[PDB]
Amino acid sequence: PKMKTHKGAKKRVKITASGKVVAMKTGKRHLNWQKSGKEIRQKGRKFVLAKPEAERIKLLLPYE
Amino acid sequence: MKLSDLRPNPGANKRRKRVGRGPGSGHGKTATRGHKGQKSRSGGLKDPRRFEGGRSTTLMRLPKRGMQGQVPGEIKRPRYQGVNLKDLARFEGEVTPELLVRAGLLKKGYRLKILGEGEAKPLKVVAHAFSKSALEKLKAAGGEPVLLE
Amino acid sequence: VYQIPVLSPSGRRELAADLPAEINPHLLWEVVRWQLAKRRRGTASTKTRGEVAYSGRKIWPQKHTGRARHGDIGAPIFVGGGVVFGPKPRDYSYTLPKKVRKKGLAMAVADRAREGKLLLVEAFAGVNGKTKEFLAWAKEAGLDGSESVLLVTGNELVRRAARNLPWVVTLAPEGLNVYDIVRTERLVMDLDAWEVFQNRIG
Amino acid sequence: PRLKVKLVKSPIGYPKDQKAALKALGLRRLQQERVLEDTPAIRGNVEKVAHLVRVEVVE
RNA sequence: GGGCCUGACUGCGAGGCCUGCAAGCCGAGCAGGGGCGAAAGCCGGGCCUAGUGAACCGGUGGUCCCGUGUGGAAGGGCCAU
RNA sequence: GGAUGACCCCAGGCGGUAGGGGAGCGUUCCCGAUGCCGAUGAAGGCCGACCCGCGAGGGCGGCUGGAGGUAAGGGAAGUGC
RNA sequence: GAGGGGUUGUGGCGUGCCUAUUGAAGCAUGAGCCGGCGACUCACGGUCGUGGGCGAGCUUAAGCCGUUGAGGCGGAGGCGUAGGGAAACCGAGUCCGAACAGGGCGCAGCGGCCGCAAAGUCCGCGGCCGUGGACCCGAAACCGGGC
RNA sequence: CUGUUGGGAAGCAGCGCCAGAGAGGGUGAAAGCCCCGUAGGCGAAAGGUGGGGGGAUAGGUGAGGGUACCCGAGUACCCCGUGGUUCGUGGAGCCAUGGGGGAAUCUGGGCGGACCACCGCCUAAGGCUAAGUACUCCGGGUGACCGAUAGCGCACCAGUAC
RNA sequence: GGGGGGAACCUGGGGAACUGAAACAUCUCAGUACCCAGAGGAGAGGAAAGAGAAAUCGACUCCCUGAGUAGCGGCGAGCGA
Ligand SMILES: [Mg+2]
Ligand SMILES: [Mg+2]
Ligand SMILES: [Mg+2]
Ligand SMILES: [Mg+2]
Ligand SMILES: [Mg+2]
Ligand SMILES: [Mg+2]
Ligand SMILES: [Mg+2]
Ligand SMILES: [Mg+2]
Ligand SMILES: [Mg+2]
Ligand SMILES: [Mg+2]
Ligand SMILES: [Mg+2]
Ligand SMILES: [Mg+2]
Ligand SMILES: [Mg+2]
Ligand SMILES: [Mg+2]
Ligand SMILES: [Mg+2]
Ligand SMILES: [Mg+2]
Ligand SMILES: [Mg+2]
Ligand SMILES: [Mg+2]
Ligand SMILES: [Mg+2]
Ligand SMILES: [Mg+2]
Ligand SMILES: [Mg+2]
Ligand SMILES: [Mg+2]
Ligand SMILES: [Mg+2]
Ligand SMILES: [Mg+2]
Ligand SMILES: [Mg+2]
Ligand SMILES: [Mg+2]
Ligand SMILES: [Mg+2]
Ligand SMILES: [Mg+2]
Ligand SMILES: [Mg+2]
Ligand SMILES: [Mg+2]
Ligand SMILES: [Mg+2]
Ligand SMILES: [Mg+2]
Ligand SMILES: [Mg+2]
Ligand SMILES: [Mg+2]
Ligand SMILES: [Mg+2]
Ligand SMILES: [Mg+2]
Ligand SMILES: [Mg+2]
Ligand SMILES: [Mg+2]
Ligand SMILES: [Mg+2]
Ligand SMILES: [Mg+2]
Ligand SMILES: [Mg+2]
Ligand SMILES: [Mg+2]
Ligand SMILES: [Mg+2]
Ligand SMILES: [Mg+2]
Ligand SMILES: [Mg+2]
Ligand SMILES: [Mg+2]
Ligand SMILES: [Mg+2]
Ligand SMILES: [Mg+2]
Ligand SMILES: [Mg+2]
Ligand SMILES: [Mg+2]
Ligand SMILES: [Mg+2]
Ligand SMILES: [Mg+2]
Ligand SMILES: [Mg+2]
Ligand SMILES: [Mg+2]
Ligand SMILES: [Mg+2]
Ligand SMILES: [Mg+2]
Ligand SMILES: [Mg+2]
Ligand SMILES: [Mg+2]
Ligand SMILES: [Mg+2]
Ligand SMILES: [Mg+2]
Ligand SMILES: [Mg+2]
Ligand SMILES: [Mg+2]
Ligand SMILES: [Mg+2]
Ligand SMILES: [Mg+2]
Ligand SMILES: [Mg+2]
Ligand SMILES: [Mg+2]
Ligand SMILES: [Mg+2]
Ligand SMILES: [Mg+2]
Ligand SMILES: [Mg+2]
Ligand SMILES: [Mg+2]
Ligand SMILES: [Mg+2]
Ligand SMILES: [Mg+2]
Ligand SMILES: [Mg+2]
Ligand SMILES: [Mg+2]
Ligand SMILES: [Mg+2]
Ligand SMILES: [Mg+2]
Ligand SMILES: [Mg+2]
Ligand SMILES: [Mg+2]
Ligand SMILES: [Mg+2]
Ligand SMILES: [Mg+2]
Ligand SMILES: [Mg+2]
Ligand SMILES: [Mg+2]
Ligand SMILES: [Mg+2]
Ligand SMILES: [Mg+2]
Ligand SMILES: [Mg+2]
Ligand SMILES: [Mg+2]
Ligand SMILES: [Mg+2]
Ligand SMILES: [Mg+2]
Ligand SMILES: [Mg+2]
Ligand SMILES: [Mg+2]
Ligand SMILES: [Mg+2]
Ligand SMILES: [Mg+2]
Ligand SMILES: [Mg+2]
Ligand SMILES: [Mg+2]
Ligand SMILES: [Mg+2]
Ligand SMILES: [Mg+2]
Ligand SMILES: [Mg+2]
Ligand SMILES: [Mg+2]
Ligand SMILES: [Mg+2]
Ligand SMILES: [Mg+2]
Ligand SMILES: [Mg+2]
Ligand SMILES: [Mg+2]
Ligand SMILES: [Mg+2]
Ligand SMILES: [Mg+2]
Ligand SMILES: [Mg+2]
Ligand SMILES: [Mg+2]
Ligand SMILES: [Mg+2]
Ligand SMILES: [Mg+2]
Ligand SMILES: [Mg+2]
Ligand SMILES: [Mg+2]
Ligand SMILES: [Mg+2]
Ligand SMILES: [Mg+2]
Ligand SMILES: [Mg+2]
Ligand SMILES: [Mg+2]
Ligand SMILES: [Mg+2]
Ligand SMILES: [Mg+2]
Ligand SMILES: [Mg+2]
Ligand SMILES: [Mg+2]
Ligand SMILES: [Mg+2]
Ligand SMILES: [Mg+2]
Ligand SMILES: [Mg+2]
Ligand SMILES: [Mg+2]
Ligand SMILES: [Mg+2]
Ligand SMILES: [Mg+2]
Ligand SMILES: [Mg+2]
Ligand SMILES: [Mg+2]
Ligand SMILES: [Mg+2]
Ligand SMILES: [Mg+2]
Ligand SMILES: [Mg+2]
Ligand SMILES: [Mg+2]
Ligand SMILES: [Mg+2]
Ligand SMILES: [Mg+2]
Ligand SMILES: [Mg+2]
Ligand SMILES: [Mg+2]
Ligand SMILES: [Mg+2]
Ligand SMILES: [Mg+2]
Ligand SMILES: [Mg+2]
Ligand SMILES: [Mg+2]
Ligand SMILES: [Mg+2]
Ligand SMILES: [Mg+2]
Ligand SMILES: [Mg+2]
Ligand SMILES: [Mg+2]
Ligand SMILES: [Mg+2]
Ligand SMILES: [Mg+2]
Ligand SMILES: [Mg+2]
Ligand SMILES: [Mg+2]
Ligand SMILES: [Mg+2]
Ligand SMILES: [Mg+2]
Ligand SMILES: [Mg+2]
Ligand SMILES: [Mg+2]
Ligand SMILES: [Mg+2]
Ligand SMILES: [Mg+2]
Ligand SMILES: [Mg+2]
Ligand SMILES: [Mg+2]
Ligand SMILES: [Mg+2]
Ligand SMILES: [Mg+2]
Ligand SMILES: [Mg+2]
Ligand SMILES: [Mg+2]
Ligand SMILES: [Mg+2]
Ligand SMILES: [Mg+2]
Ligand SMILES: [Mg+2]
Ligand SMILES: [Mg+2]
Ligand SMILES: [Mg+2]
Ligand SMILES: [Mg+2]
Ligand SMILES: [Mg+2]
Ligand SMILES: [Mg+2]
Ligand SMILES: [Mg+2]
Ligand SMILES: [Mg+2]
Ligand SMILES: [Mg+2]
Ligand SMILES: [Mg+2]
Ligand SMILES: [Mg+2]
Ligand SMILES: [Mg+2]
Ligand SMILES: [Mg+2]
Ligand SMILES: [Mg+2]
Ligand SMILES: [Mg+2]
Ligand SMILES: [Mg+2]
Ligand SMILES: [Mg+2]
Ligand SMILES: [Mg+2]
Ligand SMILES: [Mg+2]
Ligand SMILES: [Mg+2]
Ligand SMILES: [Mg+2]
Ligand SMILES: [Mg+2]
Ligand SMILES: [Mg+2]
Ligand SMILES: [Mg+2]
Ligand SMILES: [Mg+2]
Ligand SMILES: [Mg+2]
Ligand SMILES: [Mg+2]
Ligand SMILES: [Mg+2]
Ligand SMILES: [Mg+2]
Ligand SMILES: [Mg+2]
Ligand SMILES: [Mg+2]
Ligand SMILES: [Mg+2]
Ligand SMILES: [Mg+2]
Ligand SMILES: [Mg+2]
Ligand SMILES: [Mg+2]
Ligand SMILES: [Mg+2]
Ligand SMILES: [Mg+2]
Ligand SMILES: [Mg+2]
Ligand SMILES: [Mg+2]
Ligand SMILES: [Mg+2]
Ligand SMILES: [Mg+2]
Ligand SMILES: [Mg+2]
Ligand SMILES: [Mg+2]
Ligand SMILES: [Mg+2]
Ligand SMILES: [Mg+2]
Ligand SMILES: [Mg+2]
Ligand SMILES: [Mg+2]
Ligand SMILES: [Mg+2]
Ligand SMILES: [Mg+2]
Ligand SMILES: [Mg+2]
Ligand SMILES: [Mg+2]
Ligand SMILES: [Mg+2]
Ligand SMILES: [Mg+2]
Ligand SMILES: [Mg+2]
Ligand SMILES: [Mg+2]
Ligand SMILES: [Mg+2]
Ligand SMILES: [Mg+2]
Ligand SMILES: [Mg+2]
Ligand SMILES: [Mg+2]
Ligand SMILES: [Mg+2]
Ligand SMILES: [Mg+2]
Ligand SMILES: [Mg+2]
Ligand SMILES: [Mg+2]
Ligand SMILES: [Mg+2]
Ligand SMILES: [Mg+2]
Ligand SMILES: [Mg+2]
Ligand SMILES: [Mg+2]
Ligand SMILES: [Mg+2]
Ligand SMILES: [Mg+2]
Ligand SMILES: [Mg+2]
Ligand SMILES: [Mg+2]
Ligand SMILES: [Mg+2]
Ligand SMILES: [Mg+2]
Ligand SMILES: [Mg+2]
Ligand SMILES: [Mg+2]
Ligand SMILES: [Mg+2]
Ligand SMILES: [Mg+2]
Ligand SMILES: [Mg+2]
Ligand SMILES: [Mg+2]
Ligand SMILES: [Mg+2]
């Protein structure tokens, strides 16, 4: 049978044009009142996952 | 040329790695598997693309983001695939999404949009949309843009 | 442009023909592999421990008999049990790229051209469906019988005649395939067949 | 494609209308170069002042 | 100790420390509108190093992005919590 | 060096479990084969102090056996205890 | 029949095999001996590498025709040709933002138009991954319908 | 066909012949021409089949005008409990229905993913319907299928002996 | 006229658990195994109170594709039009 796309990944992650894996920053879902705006602000951005982890999530997305 | 003269190139048909066939091969006994544990078992090892020994996985600790959709599923709306002025120099006279579909440039059931990367040709170009840059190069290289619905 | 010799009722003339200049011996191998592979029947079969006719009883208890531990006698470690990775019915066919086989068909014919072993004919004289009748024609045509021949013609009478000599493979032109072109030492064709051949390699 | 136009011969002594065609193309100086479109209008002015002009085709 | 104040900013962030990951940390300078200062400047909480919890699921205030024939709505998304 | 393994010289490396790579031998089958070996003796068996190969192995010869076997070069695996 | 084969008196040296282990001749595991059976495979999908075809294109699936160990047709569809954005949307850009700021993620062959090469894609081959019992043998057990 | 070697020729040698047949198996060893076959042809009084050719029957058939008679009931519909669908209570429609309530006959009713309007699609609560699809006890054809520990459990008096 | 039989195949009526989720309960295995009733050479389905956005299509079955898409999911394992 053909492989199935991992729907947990596809809802958290996007493969870029060269093939980096990019997600949202962790750490601002709650408990934000005493966080400096620089934390709130920098975590509202996207980052590139480290290459080892980046290439496991990519295998979970064989049809993109 | 005879039949017996037919052979492949070198490397065209490599032989396989037969394990478990004895000492002098390199893969005797444990068949390159090491000693004990999972993985060395028939069927062993959880999907190592995903599994991390029980702790919460690198994937699952990342947050979700975006519209996922909901039943009854995705919403049918017009969709556009763009084609550049460079991807038009091969033609003469007119260009329409039908002719662009035969070429292997536009995908069926997609509306046409012209994008501005490349040289503009004096072509009469029927399309569903044009980028501002694609319009300027076109309406200023001798060609006729035909916007349609 | 190779110069193919044409046999005629009105004289050995010649006829310029455009076949591939250089042959790719690996490509002709790739076509022949695929021909000989998609014809494989794929009917080797064995039975798995689950497909074998014994029952699933545990033959003796797990512990305390002093013998080995076993389960059912269908296990492949038993004589008469299942076989582990025995063959099952397989489809060995695969879609060799069209352009590849189209190329191999032109390159295989080209090799015989680049050898003086390709000979085109307009018709076959006193041959109307009898093996003697073809035999005579083959004598007048140089084709004594000291060399294997592919006979490519849409004339069934001609085909019926030669198809039984050990040194002759007969074919309708729609059947032209590189394996048979390689199998044989020479190659004879109709201008009706040459005309078709030109159609297919374009 | 485009048009790389070199003006190599002075308009001096040529008709007033040939002199204005130069000015339409934006060519005002000897050994000056303007890359233009290939509009039949733009081309005709290049074809009118053909004898004073050397033309490369780009794109 | 005092006087005026709210930078316990908003939009970004070169470059680093630390580091298996994910985190954690430090950060010049730019723009918006400011506080204090004659000014040089300083200010994106606290002498520093503990006072904390990924994601999932939901709540609330915005935004007006999607809205299953069409306009709306239901429900989501995004920003903040 | 000569000229792309055309072979010769010179120099240096070559303990090894897990494991990574490389080059080969052998087994059954297919094309090669309407061929070719074969009763003046096939396959298999028993010997061998003989030949080739680093080796796995391949020859050769004598006995047994009495009807099969199968090349160069490729192809596929129920392929080596 | 200047050698070799058999045998072995004496001298010298010498702790079986496999498995498991930091470490076994080990007084740790397995094996009486012999012959035969006995364990890393296949499908589809993936990801690399590699051998070829074509190359901004590559390729068909089911079928239909043909063959009767003959190939062909079929372009539906799939991958590629553009990305950025949750999306609307814009597009060689785009997103955050008040910004023409900063930033994230993106955007450009070799020799004389010929010749070679290449994105890519197709098929073969090989390593490895996913799904399947997935290297083979082995439970104690759970469940169903019967005896 | 003959000669030769041999227990035996189909081997080897000589001179031929057939081929729409040179697939394959036999025959004392290796046979196109010895045998059984093969290529190509022919065949059914009787039973079964007959989806194809023909015939027969059943059957099928208008146009405006008025009338508002009919158009499938414990049904639609709604609320409760569930199942089905990719849909796990979700914004949860659709299809089905165990319980309660309970219509209308085209100006009727159902659907287009809560609901409302608009615009459309369709005519529920009666039934039947080839073909293309599945399977292999059975028969035949073919294997880069097994070759007696293999291949079915059984090549043999095997679902037997025990 | 029924009754009973038939290797698989079919429909309907009932309907598990191991296992997977590296524990487990929703979920998974799976409407699978099995039981029962019935049908045949096939069975089911079938002539729109359909689809669903095409101002469109036109019974049903079956294959390829669409597509591991849309979505479903202790948004876990997975499930999947
Ligand atoms: Mg599956
Ligand atoms: Mg995303
Ligand atoms: Mg959280
Ligand atoms: Mg938030
Ligand atoms: Mg808080
Ligand atoms: Mg703080
Ligand atoms: Mg702050
Ligand atoms: Mg704050
Ligand atoms: Mg911070
Ligand atoms: Mg912000
Ligand atoms: Mg991947
Ligand atoms: Mg993948
Ligand atoms: Mg896809
Ligand atoms: Mg191989
Ligand atoms: Mg292998
Ligand atoms: Mg190897
Ligand atoms: Mg050994
Ligand atoms: Mg070995
Ligand atoms: Mg190795
Ligand atoms: Mg080793
Ligand atoms: Mg090993
Ligand atoms: Mg061992
Ligand atoms: Mg092991
Ligand atoms: Mg290994
Ligand atoms: Mg390996
Ligand atoms: Mg291992
Ligand atoms: Mg391994
Ligand atoms: Mg081990
Ligand atoms: Mg160990
Ligand atoms: Mg270990
Ligand atoms: Mg071990
Ligand atoms: Mg260990
Ligand atoms: Mg271990
Ligand atoms: Mg262990
Ligand atoms: Mg290990
Ligand atoms: Mg492994
Ligand atoms: Mg590992
Ligand atoms: Mg598993
Ligand atoms: Mg396991
Ligand atoms: Mg834990
Ligand atoms: Mg989506
Ligand atoms: Mg079998
Ligand atoms: Mg078996
Ligand atoms: Mg078994
Ligand atoms: Mg089984
Ligand atoms: Mg069983
Ligand atoms: Mg059984
Ligand atoms: Mg039994
Ligand atoms: Mg059993
Ligand atoms: Mg049991
Ligand atoms: Mg049992
Ligand atoms: Mg015991
Ligand atoms: Mg004992
Ligand atoms: Mg025992
Ligand atoms: Mg025993
Ligand atoms: Mg036991
Ligand atoms: Mg057993
Ligand atoms: Mg027994
Ligand atoms: Mg057996
Ligand atoms: Mg087994
Ligand atoms: Mg197995
Ligand atoms: Mg394969
Ligand atoms: Mg023949
Ligand atoms: Mg022949
Ligand atoms: Mg031949
Ligand atoms: Mg032949
Ligand atoms: Mg034939
Ligand atoms: Mg023929
Ligand atoms: Mg033929
Ligand atoms: Mg030849
Ligand atoms: Mg002048
Ligand atoms: Mg003047
Ligand atoms: Mg002058
Ligand atoms: Mg004038
Ligand atoms: Mg104070
Ligand atoms: Mg003030
Ligand atoms: Mg940085
Ligand atoms: Mg880091
Ligand atoms: Mg900290
Ligand atoms: Mg300022
Ligand atoms: Mg200031
Ligand atoms: Mg002041
Ligand atoms: Mg100042
Ligand atoms: Mg600052
Ligand atoms: Mg959870
Ligand atoms: Mg939330
Ligand atoms: Mg939420
Ligand atoms: Mg609100
Ligand atoms: Mg809107
Ligand atoms: Mg709106
Ligand atoms: Mg709407
Ligand atoms: Mg309104
Ligand atoms: Mg909202
Ligand atoms: Mg909400
Ligand atoms: Mg050296
Ligand atoms: Mg040396
Ligand atoms: Mg050394
Ligand atoms: Mg070594
Ligand atoms: Mg060594
Ligand atoms: Mg065989
Ligand atoms: Mg043969
Ligand atoms: Mg002989
Ligand atoms: Mg003899
Ligand atoms: Mg043999
Ligand atoms: Mg021998
Ligand atoms: Mg050696
Ligand atoms: Mg030997
Ligand atoms: Mg002898
Ligand atoms: Mg012998
Ligand atoms: Mg024989
Ligand atoms: Mg042999
Ligand atoms: Mg062989
Ligand atoms: Mg060989
Ligand atoms: Mg294989
Ligand atoms: Mg085996
Ligand atoms: Mg091998
Ligand atoms: Mg061995
Ligand atoms: Mg001696
Ligand atoms: Mg001695
Ligand atoms: Mg003595
Ligand atoms: Mg001694
Ligand atoms: Mg001793
Ligand atoms: Mg001693
Ligand atoms: Mg040993
Ligand atoms: Mg042991
Ligand atoms: Mg141990
Ligand atoms: Mg121990
Ligand atoms: Mg002891
Ligand atoms: Mg002892
Ligand atoms: Mg002990
Ligand atoms: Mg011991
Ligand atoms: Mg132990
Ligand atoms: Mg013992
Ligand atoms: Mg014993
Ligand atoms: Mg014993
Ligand atoms: Mg013994
Ligand atoms: Mg043994
Ligand atoms: Mg393997
Ligand atoms: Mg297998
Ligand atoms: Mg594969
Ligand atoms: Mg693959
Ligand atoms: Mg692969
Ligand atoms: Mg090609
Ligand atoms: Mg094509
Ligand atoms: Mg995107
Ligand atoms: Mg904005
Ligand atoms: Mg910017
Ligand atoms: Mg930018
Ligand atoms: Mg090329
Ligand atoms: Mg390629
Ligand atoms: Mg891998
Ligand atoms: Mg299993
Ligand atoms: Mg399985
Ligand atoms: Mg197992
Ligand atoms: Mg495996
Ligand atoms: Mg249980
Ligand atoms: Mg129990
Ligand atoms: Mg229990
Ligand atoms: Mg019971
Ligand atoms: Mg005699
Ligand atoms: Mg005779
Ligand atoms: Mg003779
Ligand atoms: Mg024949
Ligand atoms: Mg036959
Ligand atoms: Mg024969
Ligand atoms: Mg014969
Ligand atoms: Mg015979
Ligand atoms: Mg005899
Ligand atoms: Mg013979
Ligand atoms: Mg023979
Ligand atoms: Mg014969
Ligand atoms: Mg016949
Ligand atoms: Mg007959
Ligand atoms: Mg007949
Ligand atoms: Mg009729
Ligand atoms: Mg009527
Ligand atoms: Mg009624
Ligand atoms: Mg009711
Ligand atoms: Mg309703
Ligand atoms: Mg209630
Ligand atoms: Mg309800
Ligand atoms: Mg469902
Ligand atoms: Mg459905
Ligand atoms: Mg439900
Ligand atoms: Mg469900
Ligand atoms: Mg629902
Ligand atoms: Mg429901
Ligand atoms: Mg309803
Ligand atoms: Mg009425
Ligand atoms: Mg109405
Ligand atoms: Mg009404
Ligand atoms: Mg309804
Ligand atoms: Mg409704
Ligand atoms: Mg509807
Ligand atoms: Mg609606
Ligand atoms: Mg209406
Ligand atoms: Mg409808
Ligand atoms: Mg009605
Ligand atoms: Mg009805
Ligand atoms: Mg029916
Ligand atoms: Mg039917
Ligand atoms: Mg049969
Ligand atoms: Mg049979
Ligand atoms: Mg055999
Ligand atoms: Mg026996
Ligand atoms: Mg047996
Ligand atoms: Mg025997
Ligand atoms: Mg056997
Ligand atoms: Mg039997
Ligand atoms: Mg039987
Ligand atoms: Mg038996
Ligand atoms: Mg008996
Ligand atoms: Mg009964
Ligand atoms: Mg019955
Ligand atoms: Mg059933
Ligand atoms: Mg049922
Ligand atoms: Mg029960
Ligand atoms: Mg369970
Ligand atoms: Mg359980
Ligand atoms: Mg579990
Ligand atoms: Mg577990
Ligand atoms: Mg447990
Ligand atoms: Mg459970
Ligand atoms: Mg459940
Ligand atoms: Mg299962
Ligand atoms: Mg289920
Ligand atoms: Mg059911
Ligand atoms: Mg049928
Ligand atoms: Mg039927
Ligand atoms: Mg009706
Ligand atoms: Mg009706
Ligand atoms: Mg419908
Ligand atoms: Mg319509
Ligand atoms: Mg209708
Ligand atoms: Mg489908
Ligand atoms: Mg698609
Ligand atoms: Mg689900
Ligand atoms: Mg999720
Ligand atoms: Mg699931
Ligand atoms: Mg399910």
How many domains does chain D divide into? 1
Q: What method was applied to determine this entry?
A: X-ray
Residue C16, both tokens? 């310029």
Count CB neighbours of D3 within 10 A. Answer: 20
Q: Where are the alpha helices (DSSP H) in C79-201?
A: 98-113, 131-140, 156-162, 178-183, 191-200
Q: Dihedral angle at the C-alpha atoms of C59, C65, C67, C73, nearest 10 degrees? A: 0
Residue B143 CA to residue B120 CA, distance in Å, equals: 8
Chains A and D touch (3+ CB pairs under 8 A): no
For chain C, the distance separating the N- and C-terminal CA atoms, rounded to the nearest angstrom, is 16
Q: Does residue A21 contact residue A57 with C-beta atoms inside 8 Å?
A: yes
β-bridge mates for residue C150, sequence order: C169, C187
For chain B, the distance separating the N- and C-terminal CA atoms, rounded to the nearest angstrom, is 61
Q: Pick from D37, D40, D59: which is nearest to B140 by CB?
A: D37
* CA neighbor of B2 nearest in space, from A47, C130, C108, A34: C108
Q: Which amino acid is at D50?
A: A
- Chain center to CA of A44: 12
Residue C183 CA to residue C35 CA, distance in Å, equals: 13
Query: Any idea what the CATH number is for the domain that residue D46 is in?
Result: 3.30.1390.20
Q: Where are the alpha helices (DSSP H) in D1-59?
A: 16-25, 40-48
Q: What is the CA radius of gyration of chain D?
A: 10
Residue written as token pair 């689950």:
C50
Q: Does residue C161 contact residue C131 with C-beta atoms inside 8 Å?
A: yes
Q: Pick from A8, A24, A29: which is nearest to B59 by CB?
A: A8
Q: Does residue C176 contact residue C195 with C-beta atoms inside 8 Å?
A: no
* CA neighbor of C24 nearest in space, from C106, C132, C80: C106
Footprint of strand I on the protein (CB under 7 A): A 1-8, 11, 63; B 38, 46-47, 50-51, 53-54, 60, 64, 68-71, 73-74, 76
Q: Does residue B92 contact residue B125 with C-beta atoms inside 8 Å?
A: no
Query: What chain B residue is nearest to A10 in terms of C-alpha separation?
Result: B64
Q: Does residue C27 contact residue C103 with C-beta atoms inside 8 Å?
A: yes
Those residues with Cβ within 8 angstroms of residue A62's Cβ, 6 or more apart along the chain or in another chain: A3, A5
Q: What is the CA radius of gyration of chain A?
A: 15
Q: Domain containing D15: what range?
A: 1-59
Distance from the alpha carbon of residue C50 to the mean position of ligand 135, in angstroms = 30
